[PDB]
Amino acid sequence: LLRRYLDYPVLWKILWGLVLGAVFGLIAGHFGYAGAVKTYIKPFGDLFVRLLKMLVMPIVLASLVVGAASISPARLGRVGVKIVVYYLATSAMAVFFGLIVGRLFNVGANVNLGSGTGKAIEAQPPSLVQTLLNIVPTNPFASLAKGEVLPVIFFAIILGIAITYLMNRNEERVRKSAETLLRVFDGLAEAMYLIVGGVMQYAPIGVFALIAYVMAEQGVRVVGPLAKVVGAVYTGLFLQIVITYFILLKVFGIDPIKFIRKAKDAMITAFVTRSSSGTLPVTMRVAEEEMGVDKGIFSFTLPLGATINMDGTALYQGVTVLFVANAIGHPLTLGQQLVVVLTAVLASIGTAGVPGAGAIMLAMVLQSVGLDLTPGSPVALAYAMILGIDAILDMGRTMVNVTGDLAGTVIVAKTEKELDESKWIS
Amino acid sequence: SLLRRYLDYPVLWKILWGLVLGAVFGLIAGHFGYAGAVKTYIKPFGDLFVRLLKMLVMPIVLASLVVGAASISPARLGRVGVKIVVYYLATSAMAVFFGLIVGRLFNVGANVNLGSGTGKAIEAQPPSLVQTLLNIVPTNPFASLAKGEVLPVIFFAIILGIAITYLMNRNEERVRKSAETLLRVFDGLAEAMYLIVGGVMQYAPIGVFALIAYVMAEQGVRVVGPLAKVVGAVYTGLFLQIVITYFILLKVFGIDPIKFIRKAKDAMITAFVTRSSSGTLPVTMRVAEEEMGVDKGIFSFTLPLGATINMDGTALYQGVTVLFVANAIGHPLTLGQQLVVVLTAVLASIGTAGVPGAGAIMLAMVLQSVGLDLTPGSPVALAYAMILGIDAILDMGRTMVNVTGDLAGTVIVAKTEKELDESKWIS
Amino acid sequence: RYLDYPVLWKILWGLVLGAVFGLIAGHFGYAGAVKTYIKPFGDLFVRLLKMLVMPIVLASLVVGAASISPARLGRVGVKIVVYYLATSAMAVFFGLIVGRLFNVGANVNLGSGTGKAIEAQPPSLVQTLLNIVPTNPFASLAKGEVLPVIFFAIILGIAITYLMNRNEERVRKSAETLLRVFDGLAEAMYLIVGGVMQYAPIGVFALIAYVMAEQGVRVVGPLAKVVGAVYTGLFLQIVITYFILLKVFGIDPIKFIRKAKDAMITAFVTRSSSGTLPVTMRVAEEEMGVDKGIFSFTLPLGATINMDGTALYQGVTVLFVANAIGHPLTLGQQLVVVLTAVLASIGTAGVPGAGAIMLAMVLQSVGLDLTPGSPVALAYAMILGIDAILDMGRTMVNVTGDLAGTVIVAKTEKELDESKWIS
Ligand SMILES: N[C@H](C(=O)O)[C@H](OCc1ccccc1)C(=O)O
Ligand SMILES: N[C@H](C(=O)O)[C@H](OCc1ccccc1)C(=O)O
């Protein structure tokens, strides 16, 4: 009778896992029991996170090669530039919403910071041209064996274009060899999609465990000013999803409610996994088999959007800037806010592919608007206070990042006349 | 007697000859005072052999494991399939466990002590067993290939093989063709690795000679006492394996074990005399057909699958030899990496070759998974050279229990399915 | 547009424009502007060229060694190693000759200071001969190591060609699909190289512009004779040694150079022989006519162990720092220089930064040690100032030697397709 578990449709099976995990974590971590949760429950969550991370590199390499090798380079270039301008616009609007909400909700009214060696991170912004040079891999195998997503994107696209140029050639040997290499990569991509199907069949347990641990450990650090911060962040995220993405899908024809009902599979995996590059397998599978997007559009726009299009992250940064500026007692004016917007939009590009860049971008936005992040200063104390409930903030903004990647893929597909209209209508 | 003739002598006996010649050469050149004269003019060949052996460890556990897992996957396992595969895996696990038990009991490799210290960076932090299990799933399979990890890539290869079979069972044409081609690529890689591991095993005599010569010249340690102890321990472990494992597994599934022994006598003797698990496949097929009583289907499907994935003798030999290496180089194994040895030996038993070097390579893989660097010069390489320089005796001993387990599993799967007639068993 | 031109001699007019504009930007004091707004293109080109070295080497070598008999492969290897040793020795000989000619390091006031002094860590020859065997081939691919990949690809290609001659069927149809995978990979890599050569003019221009900007102002006085000595040594090395070897083995010198102007100009600015491997392999196969059996096993090996212009620079630098600290050498010390230079070319292949270690060996072999504070570590810190403009040409010659030796071994092995060589 175990099969009923494995034979349960996973659409309304994740949400139940997530909600029951939230309830269990809140009723456990409120009675002083987070230790048993972290020792006996959270291993399942970490196993699920690692099971998802295991697929991100083979899936991106294989699917991207098979896609780019099935698309004319002109279409690939126009899709690239369209999705890039879309990503910049969405990050800008997300920081705009973040600042608007932070000013509205009056986040950080009286933070009442203490005294101590606050958390500080040396900004050290990598150069922009240096980052655009790091997109080219000095070694493709070393860029595979390091978890970097952008260099392998570049190499996979180049290899796909070369492979289709080969399959356009005239000599039988080279054409057959190109076809065989493409069949290898196709089999690899499809095997990875099947493994993703299996992992998502297992996913309710991992989602339960993860959300239970997260809402149990930090289910009590949400009080007073931290409660204000988490409320303002989640309100900004819900307003980004319900205003910007809804209007952008409604202006290009895509029905918003349908897109959300279909992306609820890769949304509740991001909201819990707390990594946009982690849930890349789930979102690529959902954009291929629940949206009807050509494998040349989503396979290019989802992995890139997993390292560039950070909307929830940009919103969290734009609102924690207001929080820290109100904590130190020197509020932000109406021009420094535009500087924050520009600097966040530019930092999302300047940290494209850098691992652990969740704090470098915040250091950039704080340095460019005068708030030096030198340690021991009150600004470091407020940033450490935020890093406190970060684990409960890092949940929603990952969901917003992945929903943004998906909405960008869907829009670029629909505007390029390669979106399956059959599985959209009812 | 040129080197062209040297390539026709059997590999395992060449290796034992090389180890004995290395013993006598080290003794002579150490008593005459030529230690520094063999650490530079003889040792490089041993280091070359170690670097040539450690190379095939990663491309084998990636390709061979994929093909293996793609030959036993649940996408093509009916009732008999799963019921024999769970048996093969459980018996391999209990065989590695018996290897560990009898190795710790006999205290294998305690009078060799060729290690520098009793621990400097190892045996200083406890690896959480839960966190050690969550290291099976790799956060990046290519990073676990390029970093030289054996268990994460084994898990990823198993998962890829199962996925590829589930693809090959798909009604579509493009994806089925793609899965066929990917499996053919991995099959070709595994086969090329088997060719290269045959060449390396042909080179292995000179490497074992150089390593043992350097050891016995520099250090006065002898490799006869502990090695006879390891031989005795592996054979006692095989005896305990047969008796305990198969007699309980039979008496629990309604079978008289004495008749099982008196009937599999033929296959046991011929496997012990041929030193090959597959070279005795016709004989064990005949014994299971006309002397045991199995029907054509079961003894035609399980016996080849058992010739491929079901290996207890090699599993027990690893469970004893990794413990010998641990107790030899100085710092023994914990309780959180004995299970890593068990898991790696088991999950590696599902992808095998049959080539002579199917124990040496599947022991380098274990020595890398549990974590014991085979770095050239490190005492792990020297103790592994010792334990590989006697592959003949252990091989001839364990090839018997391999096919013994094959027959026991075939008869078990038959008797839990009512397809073996009683006219051959009941008197 | 822009792609409508034969790039055979568009790289030349990229290079000349780059050199003149770099000299101008250096004369006018603008090195910052060029390094900040021009060198990005050069670095993009260098990375586009390095991106292919490992896949092109692996695939090309496997496909080649799976279509050649191991005995023919061994004969080819012996021939090419003999050639590499001979050319390294003769290059050091030419370096010493032209150094004594120009009186390198005749007089120069060093000036006491810190001075560059790298710790000479000389590995034994046996260690750098065992390091050719990879402990883990994927770890050798993921580390930029070319020689372990050479070994693994050679033995894998031989194993594949041994499988494709087996009476079995499931393995005969499975070791010919892996071979076609590697064939497709090598072909796609040659296509990507042919697509990068379109951008190669901008890259060459930017690279040589930056290099002639930041160094074109330092080549004055006693530091200006050493560059003349190195470049006259390189020109003499080519025009004498390579032309004599070619005209002896039948190959045409002039046609050879006119055929190599694609992988000499893109190595004279890439400043890395192991990085310009894709372009030189493509140019060998598609302009010289060598089959994938010779130019895939000899070209990366020559990019790793053959250093002709580098050894000429070692000879010139040895004579420089010897005549500059007031210590002239002798004929015997010069023979020592030559032999230690060849043995350092061999017994250093593989370790990163191998360009400052073999120099330490060829210096310690004459009595001048790289000790910090000593006059040698102050007389060599000065010759290191112009190392870019002194390394460009010697990388050019390090690659021209690879091409010449590949063509020599080919024409000796009848592999050289004689239809691509006469018009
Ligand atoms: N939550 C996301 C994630 O963990 O992937 C996000 O990741 C940080 C990041 C990493 C790389 C590039 C941009 C942003 C974040 O933490 O803000
Ligand atoms: N960079 C030059 C070249 O590759 O030709 C050469 O560098 C030596 C070198 C560099 C890297 C690896 C091996 C040898 C030199 O400076 O003379």
Residue numbers in the entry:
A (entry chain B): 5 to 430
B (entry chain A): 4 to 430
C (entry chain C): 8 to 430
Text lifted from the article:
Structural studies of the archaeal homologs GltPh from Pyrococcus horikoshii and GltTk from Thermococcus kodakarensis have provided the structural basis for understanding of the transport mechanism. Both GltPh and GltTk couple uptake of one aspartate molecule to symport of three sodium ions. Glutamate transporters and their archaeal homologs are homotrimers, in which each protomer consists of a rigid scaffold domain involved in oligomerization and anchoring of the protein in the membrane, and a mobile transport domain that binds the substrate and cations and transports its cargo in an elevator-like motion across the membrane. Here we report cryo-EM structures of the glutamate transporter homolog GltTk in nanodiscs, revealing a variety of asymmetric arrangements of the transport domains.
To test whether this state could be visited in our nanodisc preparations, we determined a structure in the presence of 120 µM DL-TBOA. Cryo-EM analysis of GltTk in this condition shows an asymmetric trimer with one transport domain positioned in an inward-oriented state and two domains in a fully-outward-state. The structure of the inward-oriented protomer is identical to the ones described above, and is similarly interpreted as representing a Na+-only state. The fully-outward protomers have wide open HP2 gates (distance between the tips of HP1 and HP2 13.8–14.5 Å), and show density for bound TBOA. The structures of these protomers are similar to those of crystal structures of GltPh in the presence of TBOA (rmsd 0.670 Å), and show that the fully-outward conformation is accessible in the nanodisc environment. This structure also reveals that the tip of HP1 of GltTk moves as much as 24 Å across the lipid bilayer in the transition between inward and outward states. The asymmetric GltTk structure with only two protomers occupied by the inhibitor suggests that the concentration of TBOA used was not saturating, which is consistent with the concentrations of Na+, DL-TBOA and protein used in the experiment, expected to lead to ~83% saturation. The same HP2 gate also opens in the outward-oriented state, captured here in the presence of TBOA, and prevents the transport domain from moving inward. In both cases, the tip and N-terminal helix of HP2 (HP2a) are displaced away from the aspartate binding site, and obstruct the movement of the transport domain along the scaffold.
